[PDB]
Design a binder for this molecule. Structure first.
Ligand SMILES: Nc1ncnc2c1ncn2[C@@H]1O[C@H](COP(=O)(O)OP(=O)(O)OP(=O)(O)O)[C@@H](O)[C@H]1O
Ligand SMILES: Nc1ncnc2c1ncn2[C@@H]1O[C@H](COP(=O)(O)OP(=O)(O)OP(=O)(O)O)[C@@H](O)[C@H]1O
Ligand SMILES: Nc1ncnc2c1ncn2[C@@H]1O[C@H](COP(=O)(O)OP(=O)(O)OP(=O)(O)O)[C@@H](O)[C@H]1O
Ligand SMILES: Nc1ncnc2c1ncn2[C@@H]1O[C@H](COP(=O)(O)OP(=O)(O)O)[C@@H](O)[C@H]1O
Ligand SMILES: [Mg+2]
Ligand SMILES: [Mg+2]
Ligand SMILES: [Mg+2]
Lengths: 143, 407, 248, 304, 396, 278, 119, 11
């Protein structure tokens, strides 16, 4: 946002970028796109009228999206033809897409330790426990 | 009525009843102190030699020559090559702190020897590029790499077999057998962020990985990556990672990531953002180079740095289970002078919810009980006395009067 | 902090709410009962004595529970009414059931359990009211009982509660009289203690309130001395005070 | 220059061109931790401090006596009392006994008051107190007088998001400086506060604050004395019973007593006089010594 | 390893009753001291060149001190001036091309920058004052009671240096790092001041607030320096008193200033038990509040023995009294048990104020002999700041 | 050479071009209050001989307290236009600066600036922000508000006694203030500014309007008698907006009709209420 | 409040502090020289929808006639900020379809898009 | 809640 501290150098960098963005008008082939993971700390100046004003909203994916997202990062692996990616999505909530990839990568690894080629559905589920660091123990009072 | 001590009063208090040696003795003590003070000053200045070589390996006649003919050359970096006509290049050189200058080579150097970006030496007067210089090998970063392999082997890390196995499949296995991770096409996690309660084996599972490395292990201090001058933190992060890509099979171990991995927050009115921009120069850097990280407090790490795009794997070092605590015990007691019989299995159930280190102090205190009383054999009775002081003595209150409820 | 509910035990084992409650008695008026053979007295203070305030009861701080039992109050006004209501109902039940006056102490235990019971079940606020009891019985004659918000009671020979309890209690000790506690000596001390315990000097008669309990021909008259006799009482102490200055 | 005089941390001066040492120069004390040294002794003398004849005497057994005549303590075999904590209701003389000990002290009387050791940059608050007890040793015997000690030494709170953590690190310095690994010789501290329960128990443990002198609101023979030390320069009439004015002022702080004297004199300057009569006082003991009532019978009978 | 630069303690003179045995023993110390001065002074006077003089002429005056960064050739190294610049200076012959190490502080010629000398022992003035030279004067016999606490603090800092055979003959590694915690005024720092007057190993001290510099890296770099000197000077003890100043519980602070203190704790937390294990540098922390220290800084392995210092017990309080009333002059009526027995939580610093006060209440009545009333009065006058705070008569 | 020091406006020491421009006769009524302030922050600088002739050191602080909108700051805006000292205004919230050790230092810079440029008047308006009764602080925020009040207390009457530095303070509560900052010595005269009675309202009306163009039929005594307890801003309001109604209609003279149209807008302050609190 | 009716300088600058909740605002803030005039601006005026669309619709080329009236009821309680989008979002519908808006059928769905998708 | 903040100094 802003803040003689030693941040009067990055402040010049921003105003410079702030300067040029408004310098050139639309109709040009200089379309700009900027990515931030924390939009509550950005300057309001950065997003006012002629700067990044039409702001793109990236959500944390929904359940159907997660089932798909867990597919794209699994194509290059020999996943078994019977892997109900949909069922995996249900167990995979509050998951950012990257974590949705972590299950795929973890799924392949978990198969490795077991000495298998095709990732079974179980391997994927074990990833959904090891992607979040949880350690699945067969608690006794369930039966 | 606290009557103030009249001057008449003071004279008597200090002489009436005085032991006839009082004035003399107090004189002797006062004499000594001043005498000691003077004694030091006459000798306090102790010569601090300044690293001169033996007289044999001197060339004082030639030494006057080097100082006279040779000249100091400012070390700079070529940031661009204008190549004015391809015959008068007019290089632009950075003097680091001095300024940016458009300089030209002294005749000694070859036009083709000074390639863009390489460190170039200039002359103090005109800044003509007199000599090329080897790329920068950081004095601090270069010392960082663990040149002496830590002695702790993998057999010293007990009760964490599944956590060591999980680490060996990211830090060792994908580095010695890059064929199981290719057949299935699984991308090896290129970093693990060991977290666990303080004293569970995070840095022991770090030294252990170092003793069986076959790689170049770089021990990132955490302290050195936070420098006074702005930017010098990030400049070190690059100069470490750059020093890794140059090596083949390099492992970087950022112990105590909390130092330079705090969750971001706008505090630009202060030097904190200096450290934060050093992490953002590390987040960019991270996302054959494997990266390790240890953090007894993972919750203080930036969510960005814990995503499965940078730290693909997160190994949790939990408190050992019983079958492991009896193993953590035997690892630290293999060198103790214990009596053959000790029911270590029994000592594992008396240390419930105890870390992998407090088991160590139970073994270290056990002897100290065997040393206090001159027995050269640390018997079992000592350990229960040990587990009372190391674990129980600081575990909780949970005492008899409030423990006669459990039977 | 563990002062959220009256039923939560602090780690050291202290029911904070009860400490908070009984300590709350400090803000209340001062009531004292002096040692006395053949009698015992209560002296209260009318903290709010504004002018426009019509005096209709004359006994804002001294209540008569049974035909031979009187108790003051030092604490919350609302809780004081409910306790004084429960006190009398307890005493009269005893008279109905046993056709014999409730022998003092069993009155305090009955109320103390009610007050304590609040300090056990949750959701009820600890009664913030201590109250002196005086009276007579066929069992021990004149007695003095000091109730606390925390339910704990206790027999006493001379005690003060509420404002400046420390000053009153010590002085009641300083000139504490055992055996020689005739009523007249009790009255002189009682006003004598209020003189310094009550910050405003001159112990203006209307600003003090004395009720005495005597055993007369087996009738146990509980008295609330009127202003006239207090004036002479204040005068009686007032005359005695001047003679003490002769030391200078 | 004899090299024996060049101790570490000196401030030698080096010649302009050849960098040769040619003088030792006075030692460096931070520019802010040097204004704290009393150069101008105040003008409050003991004779202007009434009623505190006991406290002034209890405070001289720590500030004056142990310094002027240390031989008494050595023979008696008891260590030297070091600090005093002058607490008490506001306006009693706690900063008046201090200006007095500064007018008759013949001992460098440094003055660190309130938030003068609380600096924004971390590890600077600790530095100033380090240089304050160094300027108090090279200039010993010295008396550091820290007024409003509630500011820097309130009870240590648990380190967290919200909790004093820098005024704490400078508290843990003063805590160590007074009675720490390194014993201190001939430095005495006269902290003055109003609330004595909000200090951390390490700062009120004997060894750092030996005597904890209380300053209570004056009594009638103390209000009278105060009313006579601040009305000495006044043109009092005859029949101006300063005692009856005092008897009209129960629990009158002690600085309020002067308010009656300034106000009794202020009731005259509006009339262009130089003489203050009795009714000029009794009409002014009501102004300065004013009160706020609960102004609510609803709340006031909550408690019987 | 320069060896332990132990403190310099003059021998001790006991008797203390101020008897002639005392004067003679002080005189003997003085006599040798006068003799010792004689040799130092008579060595310069009795004491009444062509090789070094040539060297000093090549160096000239003054000589800058920058940080070496690279040994390009055998006779060329890049040295960074004291401002952060760089320089491709020449390595002259007199310098030792052995001690020249990257990171070493090199002496540079002033006119034509050229390595001329290697300046070892460049430890900051901020850590070279941390070293205790004049040993404190409180011997283990000045600390009364605390026999269980002393032994615990003598089996990590004294014994492991005198009888190392016991520990290495049994398999232990001598406990290294002890957290002295307890209520204020119990003797935490006195036991520390007593290990310095007995130890033969360099006794560095800090105050837990000295090692928090304002600069971003000044903080963590002083700690990395202190444990570099303690390691350098062989047997050493680093006493970080009032450790609560630096090492409090880590937390997600929204203030950069507080993220630099923790970036100093996470350095003391790695300069103690982390990669590249320590050498022989014991650490003695002290703190009145062990309930706020980070669970890691006092995790067994860094602070192995948590010596707990309770308020004095009745037997100890009686021994504490005599150690502070040893030099006093009590009258025959001074039966201390009247004050000790009380249930007042009289700390060990309270006891020495009930001694200073009862000796000053003696001057009030013009007496250098303190009677029994001088303690009764002093107990009250010295026992404030704690008043009386407890529950009412609820519990029976 | 010793160059002249520079302390002209470090903390907004009122320059010769920042005079508030409110004369004493412009303030309306406040006859008693004006004299009490005129007796501690104005008179002693001029006539110090009179004070020393009676043996009383002139009062050094004044604390104007009363209901909001009653003219407290106005007397202060005046004393500034009418003072030969160096007025130094500082609002209470200006001390609450972040960066602990910047707030308390601001106090130590205000009394240093006033000490150098003496005699001076330091007017801490809205002192209720930093001088609320010290309830034991248990977080690093109430602790830094208390470090400000104490730094305030320590310079006003502390070991370093200042010469000729009077302090004027204004607050709207007057009871929340810490007892140490109301003890006769720091804030000596606690002047009260009560809601204008049926008389001060007349004087207030006569000074706000005596510059306004009032059409002869406007009997200001018709509105000064209405029992409603209007405050000083409200009287300035009932007048400033009264004319704004005239200006809208383009009429250059405020007529009696508007004042009644104005008079019903500046006093129906309930409006919302909710009818069930009554 | 001080920086407005405040000693320093009264000034010649003006403030337009606009709120969404007027009950919340403190009384002092609404005064003659301390922020006056409680100008209410309710959701686009019934007729405005036309004018607003008139001022915000015409810019985008659209030869086809307009039944604005239906768009008005098709857009009840519209925030007006939505109305700006209505025409612009319609332009995206046109950006797909072809290049010239020739149908109100566009605003209808555009009205829906700037309603259900603007919820 | 309300958090007072310290600060360092990047040289
Ligand atoms: N599980 C364990 N098994 C064996 N030794 C252990 C174990 N845990 C701790 N230790 C002992 O403690 C030493 C260091 O403990 P550890 O490596 O866990 O520190 P750490 O996790 O880095 O602590 P922190 O996170 O607070 O820095 C090990 O070298 C070993 O001697
Ligand atoms: N006993 C006394 N005799 C004379 N003057 C007194 C007495 N007590 C207080 N005063 C006067 O009261 C005024 C108030 O300042 P004082 O020195 O009392 O500070 P304080 O309120 O006690 O402490 P602090 O300044 O720390 O708040 C001073 O002018 C002081 O001289
Ligand atoms: N057991 C004891 N025997 C003898 N003297 C003691 C004892 N305990 C404390 N003392 C005395 O306490 C004095 C000062 O206390 P000490 O320095 O030991 O406290 P501390 O542990 O540093 O306290 P703090 O928590 O305030 O830092 C010493 O001079 C010493 O004489
Ligand atoms: N007696 C008065 N004479 C003139 N104007 C007054 C009077 N009382 C109030 N006012 C008006 O109200 C303002 C008073 O400011 P006020 O609200 O009292 O300030 P603060 O609340 O900061 O003390 C003046 O600027 C003026 O417009
Ligand atoms: Mg580690
Ligand atoms: Mg200590
Ligand atoms: Mg104002």
């Amino acid at each position: 946002k802003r803040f003689k501290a030693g941040d009067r150098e990055v402040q010049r960098t921003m105003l410079e970028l702030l300067n040029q963005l408004d310098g050139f008008q639309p109709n040009t082939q200089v379309k700009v796109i900027a990515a931030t993971n924390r939009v509550d700390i950005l300057d309001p100046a950065l997003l006012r009228s002629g700067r990044l004003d039409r702001k793109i909203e990236f959500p944390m994916p929904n359940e159907e999206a997660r089932a798909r997202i867990m597919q794209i990062h699994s194509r290059k692996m020999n996943v078994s033809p019977d892997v109900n990616y949909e069922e995996l999505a249900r167990c995979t909530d509050d998951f950012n897409g990257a974590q949705c990839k972590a299950v795929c990568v973890e799924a392949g690894m978990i198969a490795l330790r077991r000495g298998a080629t095709e990732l079974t559905h179980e391997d994927y589920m074990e990833g959904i426990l090891e992607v979040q660091a949880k350690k699945k123990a067969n608690l006794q009072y369930y039966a | 009525p606290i009557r103030a001590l009249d001057e008449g009063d003071i004279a008597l208090l200090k002489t009436y009843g005085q032991s006839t040696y009082s004035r003399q003795i107090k004189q002797v003590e006062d004499d000594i102190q001043q005498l000691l003070k003077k004694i030091n000053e006459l000798t306090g200045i102790k010569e601090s030699d300044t690293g001169l070589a033996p007289p044999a390996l001197w060339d004082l006649a030639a030494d006057k020559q080097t100082l006279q003919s040779e000249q100091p050359l400012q070390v700079a970096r070529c940031t661009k090559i204008i190549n004015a006509d391809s015959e008068d290049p007019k290089y632009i050189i950075n003097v680091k702190q001095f300024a940016k200058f458009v300089v030209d080579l002294s005749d000694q150097v070859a036009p083709t020897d000074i390639e863009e970006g390489m460190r170039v030496g200039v002359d103090r007067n005109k800044y003509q590029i007199h000599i090329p210089l080897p790329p920068k090998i950081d004095p601090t970063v270069t010392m960082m790499q663990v040149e002496e392999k830590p002695d702790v082997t993998y057999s010293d890390v007990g009760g964490c077999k599944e956590q060591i196995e999980k680490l060996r499949e990211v830090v060792e296995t994908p580095l010695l057998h890059p064929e199981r991770f290719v057949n299935l096409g699984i991308e090896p996690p290129k970093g693990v962020l060991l977290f666990g309660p303080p004293g569970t084996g995070k840095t022991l599972c770090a030294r252990a990985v170092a003793n069986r490395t076959d790689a170049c292990f770089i021990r990132v201090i955490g302290s050195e990556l936070v420098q006074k001058y702005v930017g010098e933190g990030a400049r070190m992060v690059r100069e470490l990672f750059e020093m890794a890509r140059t090596k083949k099979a390099c492992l970087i171990f950022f112990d105590e990531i909390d130092a330079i991995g705090g969750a971001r927050f706008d505090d630009g009115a202060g030097g904190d953002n200096e450290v934060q921009r050093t992490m953002l120069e590390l987040i960019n850097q991270l996302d054959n180079i494997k990266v390790l990280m240890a953090t007894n407090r993972p919750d203080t790490l930036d969510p960005a740095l814990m995503r499965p795009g940078r730290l693909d794997r997160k190994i949790e070092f939990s408190l050992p289970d019983l079958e492991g605590r009896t193993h953590i015990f035997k690892i630290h007691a293999r060198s103790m002078s214990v009596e053959r019989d000790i029911r270590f299995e029994l000592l594992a159930r008396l240390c419930p919810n105890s870390t992998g280190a407090e088991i160590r102090s139970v073994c270290t205190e056990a002897g100290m009980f065997a040393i206090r009383a001159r027995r050269k054999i640390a018997t079992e009775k000592d350990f229960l006395e040990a587990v009372n002081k190391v674990i129980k003595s600081y575990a909780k209150f949970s005492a008899t009067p409030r423990y006669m409820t459990y039977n | 902090r563990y002062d959220s509910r009256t039923t939560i035990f602090s780690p050291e084992g202290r029911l904070y709410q009860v400490e908070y409650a009984m300590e709350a008695i400090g803000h209340a008026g001062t009531c004292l009962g002096i040692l006395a053979n053949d009698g015992v007295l209560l002296a209260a203070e009318r903290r709010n004595i504004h002018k426009l305030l019509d005096e209709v009861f004359f006994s804002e701080k001294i209540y008569k529970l049974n035909e031979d039992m009187a108790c003051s109050v030092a604490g919350i006004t609302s809780d004081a009414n409910v306790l004084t209501n429960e006190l009398r109902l307890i005493a009269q039940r005893y008279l109905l059931q046993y056709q014999e006056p409730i022998p003092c102490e069993q009155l305090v235990t009955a109320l103390c359990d009610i007050k304590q019971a609040y300090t056990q079940f949750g959701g009820k606020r600890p009664f913030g009211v201590s109250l002196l009891y005086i009276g007579w019985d066929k069992h021990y004659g004149f007695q003095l009982y000091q109730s606390d918000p925390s339910g704990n009671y206790g027999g006493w020979k001379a005690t003060c509660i509420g404002n400046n309890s420390a000053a009153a209690v010590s002085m009641l000790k300083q000139d504490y009289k055992e055996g020689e506690m005739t009523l007249k000596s009790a009255l002189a001390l009682a006003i004598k203690v209020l003189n310094k315990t009550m910050d405003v000097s001159k112990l203006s008669a209307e600003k003090v309130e004395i009720a005495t309990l005597t055993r007369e021909n087996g009738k146990t008259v509980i008295r609330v001395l009127k202003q006239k006799e207090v004036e002479q009482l204040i005068k009686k102490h007032e005359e005695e005070e001047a003679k003490a200055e002769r030391e200078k | 220059i004899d090299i024996n005089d060049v101790t570490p941390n000196c401030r030698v001066a080096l010649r302009n061109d050849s960098y040769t040492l040619h003088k030792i120069l006075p030692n460096k004390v931070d520019p802010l931790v040097s204004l704290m040294m009393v150069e101008k002794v105040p003008d409050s003398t003991y004779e202007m401090i009434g009623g505190l004849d006991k406290q002034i005497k209890e405070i001289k057994e720590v500030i004056e006596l142990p310094v002027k005549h240390p031989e008494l303590f050595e023979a008696l075999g008891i260590a030297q009392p070091k600090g005093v904590l002058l607490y008490g209701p506001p306006g009693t003389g706690k900063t008046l006994l201090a200006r007095a000990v500064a007018h008759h002290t013949d001992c460098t009387f440094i003055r660190v008051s309130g938030s003068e050791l609380v600096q924004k940059f971390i590890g600077e608050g600790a530095r100033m107190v380090r240089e304050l007890f160094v300027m108090a040793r090279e200039h010993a015997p010295s008396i550091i007088f820290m007024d409003e000690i509630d500011s820097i030494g309130s009870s240590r709170l648990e380190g967290g998001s919200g909790g004093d953590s820098e005024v704490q690190r400078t508290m843990l310095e003063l805590l160590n400086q007074l009675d720490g690994f390194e014993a201190t010789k001939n430095i005495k501290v006269i902290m003055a506060t109003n609330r004595i329960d909000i200090l951390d128990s390490a700062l009120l443990r004997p060894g750092r604050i030996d005597r904890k002198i209380e300053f209570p609101p004056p009594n009638e023979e103390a209000r009278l004395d105060i009313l006579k030390i601040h009305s000495r320069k006044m043109n009092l009439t005859r029949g101006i019973n300063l005692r009856k004015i005092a008897e009209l002022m129960p629990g009158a702080s002690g600085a309020e007593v002067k308010g009656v004297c300034t106000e009794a004199g202020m009731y005259a300057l509006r009339e262009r006089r130089v003489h203050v009569t009795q009714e000029d006082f009794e009409m002014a003991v009501a102004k300065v010594m004013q009160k706020d009532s609960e102004k609510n019978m609803s709340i006031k009978k909550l408690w019987k | 390893t320069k060896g332990p630069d132990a403190a310099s303690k003059l021998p001790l003179v006991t008797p203390h009753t101020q008897c002639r045995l005392k004067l003679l023993k002080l005189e003997r110390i003085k006599d040798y001291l006068l003799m010792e001065e004689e040799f130092i002074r008579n060595q310069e006077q009795m004491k009444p060149e062509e090789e070094r003089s040539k060297v000093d002429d090549l160096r000239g005056t003054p000589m800058s001190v920058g940080t070496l960064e690279e040994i390009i050739d055998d006779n060329h190294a890049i040295v960074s001036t004291s401002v952060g610049s760089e320089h491709y200076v020449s390595i002259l012959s007199f310098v030792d091309k052995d001690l020249l190490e990257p990171g070493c502080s090199v002496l540079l010629n002033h006119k034509v920058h050229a390595v001329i000398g290697v300046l070892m022992d460049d430890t900051d003035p901020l850590v070279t004052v941390m070293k205790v030279e004049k040993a404190p004067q409180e011997t283990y016999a000045d600390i009364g009671g605390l026999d269980n606490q002393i032994q615990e603090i003598k089996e990590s800092v004294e014994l492991p240096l005198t009888h190392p055979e016991y520990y290495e003959e049994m398999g232990i590694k001598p406990p290294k790092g002890v957290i002295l915690y307890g209520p204020p005024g119990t003797g935490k720092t006195l036991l520390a001041k007593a290990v310095a007057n007995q130890t033969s190993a360099t006794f560095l001290r800090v105050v837990g607030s000295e090692l928090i510099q304002k600069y971003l890296g000044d903080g963590p770099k002083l700690v990395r320096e202190l444990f570099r000197v303690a390691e350098e000077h062989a047997p050493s003890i680093v006493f970080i008193d009032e450790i609560d100043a630096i090492g409090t519980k880590r937390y997600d602070s929204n203030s950069g200033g507080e993220r630099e203190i923790q970036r100093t704790m996470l350095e003391l937390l790695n300069q103690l038990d982390g990669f590249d294990s320590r050498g022989d540098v014991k650490v003695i922390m002290a703190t009145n509040r062990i309930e706020t220290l980070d669970p890691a800084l006092i995790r067994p392995g860094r602070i192995d023995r948590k010596i707990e210092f309770p308020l004095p017990d009745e037997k100890t309080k009686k021994r504490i009294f005599q150690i502070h009333t040893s030099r006093m002059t009590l009258a025959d009526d001074v039966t201390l048990d009247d004050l000790i027995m009380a249930k007042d939580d009289l700390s060990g610093a309270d006891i020495k104020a009930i001694c200073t006060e009862a000796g000053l209440m003696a001057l009030r009545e013009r007496r250098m002999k303190v009677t029994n009333e001088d303690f009764k009065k002093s107990k009250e006058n010295v026992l404030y700041k704690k008043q009386e705070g407890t529950p009412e008569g609820l519990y029976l | 050479d010793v160059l002249p020091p520079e302390a002209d406006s470090s903390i907004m020491m009122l320059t010769s071009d920042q005079k508030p421009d409110v004369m004493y006769a412009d303030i309306g009524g406040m006859d008693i209050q004006k004299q009490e302030v005129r007796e501690a922050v104005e008179l002693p600088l001029t006539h110090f001989e009179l004070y020393k002739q009676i043996g009383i050191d002139p009062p050094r602080g004044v604390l104007m307290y009363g209901p909001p909108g009653c003219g407290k700051t106005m007397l202060a805006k005046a004393v500034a236009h009418h003072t030969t000292a160096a007025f130094i205004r500082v609002v209470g919230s200006e001390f609450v600066q972040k960066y602990l050790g910047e707030g308390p230092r601001m106090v130590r810079d205000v009394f240093r600036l006033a000490k150098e440029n003496a005699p001076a008047i330091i007017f801490i308006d809205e002192i209720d922000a930093i001088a609320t009764k010290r309830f034991d602080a248990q977080t690093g925020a109430d602790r830094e508000v208390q470090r400000i009040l104490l730094e305030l207390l320590n310079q006003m009457d502390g070991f370093d006694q200042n010469v000729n530095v009077k302090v004027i303070m204004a607050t709207n509560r007057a009871d929340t203030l810490d007892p140490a900052l109301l003890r006769p010595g720091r804030l000596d005269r606690k002047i009260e500014f009560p809601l204008p009675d049926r008389r001060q309202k007349r004087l207030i009306f006569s000074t706000i309007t005596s510059k306004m163009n009032l059409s002869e039929e406007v009997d200001l005594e018709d509105y000064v008698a209405r029992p409603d307890k209007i405050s000083g801003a409200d009287i300035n309001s009932i007048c400033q907006e009264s004319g704004m109604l005239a200006v809208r209609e383009n009429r250059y003279i405020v007529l009696a009709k508007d004042f009644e149209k104005a008079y019903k807008t500046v006093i129906k302050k309930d409006e919302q209420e909710h009818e069930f609190y009554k | 409040l001080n920086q407005m009716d405040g000693f320093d300088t009264l000034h010649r600058v003006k403030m337009i502090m606009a709120t969404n909740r007027p009950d919340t605002l403190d009384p002092a803030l609404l005064r003659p020289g301390r922020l006056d005039r409680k100008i209410h601006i309710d959701l686009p005026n019934e007729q405005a929808r036309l004018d607003i669309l008139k001022i915000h619709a015409g810019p985008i080329t659209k030869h086809g006639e307009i039944d604005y009236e239906a768009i008005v009821k098709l857009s009840d309680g519209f925030n007006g900020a939505d109305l700006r989008n209505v025409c612009t979002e319609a332009g995206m519908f046109a950006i797909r379809a072809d290049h010239d808006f020739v149908v109100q059928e566009d605003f209808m769905k555009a009205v829906r898009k700037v309603a259900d998708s603007k919820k | 809640a309300x958090x007072x903040x310290x600060x360092x100094x990047x040289x």
